[PDB]
Amino acid sequence: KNKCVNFNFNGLTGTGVLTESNKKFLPFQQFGRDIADTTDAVRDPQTL
Amino acid sequence: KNIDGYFKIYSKHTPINLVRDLPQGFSALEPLVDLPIGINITRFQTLL
C-alpha cells in the first residue's frame, strides 16, 4: 500500500496508490466508481 | 428478474403500521441473490 502499483483485482486492472478507505460498501458491492466512470475504490477478493 | 438465464433477487424488510395497503414513501431494495438457472420463466405463484 501507499505506493504506485499496477493492481489487478479479479481482472479489474489499473495503476495507482492503494490506501485504507473510509467508504461504506454494501454486503454485495465489489468496487466503486467516480463521476468519470473510473474505479475509485475496490474490495480485496481475499480480504473483506 | 430472470435476465439471460440470470435469476436476480433483491429484497428489503421494513417495519410498518398500516392495515390498508402499501405505505406511501420511498425505500430501496438491495440485491441478495443471483442464481444461474438458465431457465425461462413465464409464470409464477405464491405459497402461504
Ligand SMILES: *[C@@H]1O[C@H](CO)[C@@H](O)[C@H](O)[C@H]1NC(C)=O
Ligand atoms: C430460453 O430458452 C432457450 C431454449 O432454447 C434457452 O436456450 C435459453 O438459455 C433460455 N434463456 C433463459 C432466459 O433462460
